[PDB]
Amino acid sequence: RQWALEDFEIGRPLGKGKNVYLAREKQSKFILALKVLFKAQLEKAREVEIQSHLRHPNILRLYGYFHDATRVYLILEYAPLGTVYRELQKLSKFDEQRTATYITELANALSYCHSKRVIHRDIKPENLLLGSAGELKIAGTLDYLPPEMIEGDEKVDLWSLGVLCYEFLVGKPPFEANTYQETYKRISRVEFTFPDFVTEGARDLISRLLKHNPSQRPMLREVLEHPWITANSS
Numbered sequence: 001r002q003w004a005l006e007d008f009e010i011g012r013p014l015g016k017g018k019n020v021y022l023a024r025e026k027q028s029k030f031i032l033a034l035k036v037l038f039k040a041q042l043e044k045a046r047e048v049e050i051q052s053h054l055r056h057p058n059i060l061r062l063y064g065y066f067h068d069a070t071r072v073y074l075i076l077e078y079a080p081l082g083t084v085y086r087e088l089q090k091l092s093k094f095d096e097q098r099t100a101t102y103i104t105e106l107a108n109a110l111s112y113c114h115s116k117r118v119i120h121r122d123i124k125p126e127n128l129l130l131g132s133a134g135e136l137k138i139a140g141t142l143d144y145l146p147p148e149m150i151e152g153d154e155k156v157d158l159w160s161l162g163v164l165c166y167e168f169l170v171g172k173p174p175f176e177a178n179t180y181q182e183t184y185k186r187i188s189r190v191e192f193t194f195p196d197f198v199t200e201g202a203r204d205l206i207s208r209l210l211k212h213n214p215s216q217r218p219m220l221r222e223v224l225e226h227p228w229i230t231a232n233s234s
């Protein structure tokens with residue numbers, strides 16, 4: 001199947017900065033998202049094949065792709081409920097049942113990814129999307145980076161989960177700092193603290209995910225079978 005622009009109706013922008021559009025496949029009338037990347041803008045600053053070997057309930061599906069002279073087009077699952085980031089601003093912070101449920105969906109997604117030995121880098125709330133039943137979907141830079149990626153993998157996803165849980169429950173990442181260099185010091189020396197409201201089970205989990213020595217971070221199964229997790233997700 002060789003797709004083209006003329007195959008889809010186009011509506012409003014959804015994304016921004018390296019351009020995704022609401023779209024509709026003209027014949028079946030199916031709503032989806034079209035990412036229009038600029039080749040030139042990439043002869044500047046594959047892998048769409050790793051993405052097409054993937055099928056998971058919490059990874060954004062890639063339905064196909066095409067290109068013309070200047071542009072590469074990705075035909076993507078449209079997440080009707082928007083970004084987790086949007087929801088965090090709307091909600092301020094998430095409850096534990098909601099947080100734990102997102103952590104489980106992430107960690108499932110990440111098992112499967114590691115199982116097809118795909119390893120994602122840093123997950124940020126803006127890269128997390130929300131399906132029609134509000135199930136999560138996966139799709140400066142500092143705040144999410146682990147020590148390894150800043151100082152002098154597969155455990156870097158444990159760290160990401162850990163920043164995320166923290167961000168979900170408190171409404172802020174744990175290393176937010178007045179400056180790029182302060183954040184570097186905080187992350188790099190693992191300097192963060194919890195507001196008093198964060199419960200014991202959540203500290204234990206986040207505490208374990210956020211050790212500086214990777215090989216002391218839990219395994220994905222341990223996150224999945226974590227008592228705070230298995231207690232709180234639906």
Ligand SMILES: O=C(Cc1cc(-c2ccc3c(-c4nc5ccccc5[nH]4)n[nH]c3c2)n[nH]1)Nc1cccc(F)c1
Binds near residue numbers: 014035079083
């Ligand atoms: O290149 C990008 C960046 C990117 C942006 C998006 C993106 C952005 C927004 C949406 C949306 C979407 N739904 C919304 C509803 C309300 C407001 C905004 C929304 N964005 N659905 N699917 C999306 C997908 N995905 N990926 N991802 C990518 C690349 C290759 C393979 C792959 F699986 C993902």
